[PDB]
Design an enzyme around this catalytic site. Sequence first.
Site, PDB file in Angstrom:
ATOM      1  N   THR A 219      32.385 -14.602   2.600  1.00 24.29           N
ATOM      2  CA  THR A 219      32.655 -15.620   3.624  1.00 24.29           C
ATOM      3  C   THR A 219      33.995 -15.394   4.374  1.00 24.29           C
ATOM      4  OG1 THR A 219      31.327 -17.239   2.327  1.00 24.29           O
ATOM      5  CG2 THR A 219      32.936 -18.146   3.870  1.00 24.29           C
TER       6      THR A 219
ATOM      7  N   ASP B 188      38.926 -13.807  -0.899  1.00 26.93           N
ATOM      8  CA  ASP B 188      38.584 -15.080  -1.576  1.00 26.93           C
ATOM      9  C   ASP B 188      38.024 -14.825  -2.940  1.00 26.93           C
ATOM     10  OD1 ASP B 188      38.524 -17.800  -1.819  1.00 26.93           O
ATOM     11  OD2 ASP B 188      36.548 -18.014  -0.910  1.00 26.93           O
TER      12      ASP B 188
ATOM     13  N   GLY C 250      23.367 -11.439 -10.414  1.00 24.83           N
ATOM     14  CA  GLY C 250      24.551 -10.750 -10.952  1.00 24.83           C
ATOM     15  C   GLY C 250      25.047 -11.230 -12.292  1.00 24.83           C
ATOM     16  N   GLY C 251      24.424 -12.234 -12.859  1.00 25.76           N
ATOM     17  CA  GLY C 251      24.861 -12.801 -14.147  1.00 25.76           C
ATOM     18  C   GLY C 251      25.587 -14.095 -13.900  1.00 25.76           C
TER      19      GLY C 251
ATOM     20  N   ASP D 118      29.266 -16.387 -13.587  1.00 28.45           N
ATOM     21  CA  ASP D 118      30.622 -16.266 -13.094  1.00 28.45           C
ATOM     22  C   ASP D 118      31.680 -16.397 -14.212  1.00 28.45           C
ATOM     23  OD1 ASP D 118      31.773 -19.162 -12.732  1.00 28.45           O
ATOM     24  OD2 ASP D 118      29.729 -19.126 -11.941  1.00 28.45           O
TER      25      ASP D 118
ATOM     26  N   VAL E 225      22.719 -22.113  -3.904  1.00 22.54           N
ATOM     27  CA  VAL E 225      22.265 -20.857  -4.512  1.00 22.54           C
ATOM     28  C   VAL E 225      21.258 -21.153  -5.584  1.00 22.54           C
ATOM     29  CG1 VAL E 225      22.878 -18.645  -5.538  1.00 22.54           C
ATOM     30  CG2 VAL E 225      24.532 -19.856  -4.136  1.00 22.54           C
TER      31      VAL E 225
ATOM     32  N   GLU F 195      20.541  -9.410  -5.525  1.00 23.69           N
ATOM     33  CA  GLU F 195      20.468  -9.107  -6.927  1.00 23.69           C
ATOM     34  C   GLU F 195      21.063 -10.309  -7.721  1.00 23.69           C
ATOM     35  OE1 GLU F 195      22.886  -5.987  -9.984  1.00 23.69           O
ATOM     36  OE2 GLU F 195      23.322  -5.946  -7.822  1.00 23.69           O
TER      37      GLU F 195
ATOM     38  N   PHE G 262      29.352 -24.244   1.759  1.00 25.78           N
ATOM     39  CA  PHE G 262      28.389 -23.439   2.508  1.00 25.78           C
ATOM     40  C   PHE G 262      26.943 -23.825   2.398  1.00 25.78           C
ATOM     41  CE2 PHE G 262      28.743 -21.281  -1.599  1.00 25.78           C
ATOM     42  CZ  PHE G 262      27.451 -21.159  -1.970  1.00 25.78           C
ATOM     43  N   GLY G 263      26.535 -24.391   1.261  1.00 22.08           N
ATOM     44  CA  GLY G 263      25.124 -24.529   0.950  1.00 22.08           C
ATOM     45  C   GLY G 263      24.848 -24.319  -0.527  1.00 22.08           C
TER      46      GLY G 263
HETATM   47 NA    NA Z   1      26.879  -5.045  -9.045  1.00 23.86          NA
END
Ligand code: NA
Length: 328
Positions: A219, A179, A138-139, A141, A28, A136, A25-26
């Site tokens: 997505t 997903d 989110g921390g 993954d 972050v 936001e 997608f691109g």
């Molecule tokens: Na949250």
Amino acid sequence: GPVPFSHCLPTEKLQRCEKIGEGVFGEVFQTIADHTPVAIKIIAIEGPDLVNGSHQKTFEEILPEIIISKELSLLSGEVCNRTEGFIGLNSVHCVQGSYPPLLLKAWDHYNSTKGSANDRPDFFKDDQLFIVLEYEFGGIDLEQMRTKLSSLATAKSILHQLTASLAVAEASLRFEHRDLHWGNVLLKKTSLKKLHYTLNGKSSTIPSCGLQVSIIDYTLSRLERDGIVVFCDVSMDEDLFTGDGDYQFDIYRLMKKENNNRWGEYHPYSNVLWLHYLTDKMLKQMTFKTKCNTPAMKQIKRKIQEFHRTMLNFSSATDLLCQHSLFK
Ligand code: NA
């Protein structure tokens, strides 16, 4: 009409950008404004160049992700069906320009240290359009936290948080994530001992184990309001159903089996499939700093193993939340 990059990323915000993630997608980036971290997802649209080996989405094709981001973010402020377990959406802009040199510098730093599977985004002209989504922060993954969590007790809180968030979104929006691989589950420290949700007007709490979970990446997601369905029609996609080497790729096939390749329909069993894939990751790929050495930890392990072998007999995240013994 479209704005320049400088609208979203004024100088100081652009100077503080660090790349934190990527996909076909691109890109972050994380940055800061008003002392608060944020994540910026940047997606090229409407152009003829391949980007990361794939054609760019049109504005019509990117709209579902934008709409779904907003609806799920708004669940944090609702009453009857309320959850903070998605990710907050701060803003969305359509930007026009070549890629900022300061973002190229951040992109290069990530390529040098972690390595990238993407093209260096230096080939866009000054008429290129992008969607810039500010979320936001989110921390980190779950995949990046493979070796970083304390114990399987934390895994239990994570699965409870995910199941509750998905249930609330089922109830309010007939939502399927579609997903929810372990790159799309984010973990951040919280000082709260208990997290709160409301499902069809009934409020409950979840012990946090010191972590707050956020679900990202819409997505492939689907939802509906008043009979109007927003979704990604993957019925003619080839590559999505041909992956190998991870239970993740079986989930795409299992969703297509469940829905008979009709992606506009509501099949909340897909959320159960993803929760089974995440439970499987918890038991087979995550590795904890403290094992289940004591009898009371060996019990939590047994309960998560029981969840893994039973959960596929539930019809939705709502059914799991409301009826599964793990959450009693
Ligand atoms: Na949250």
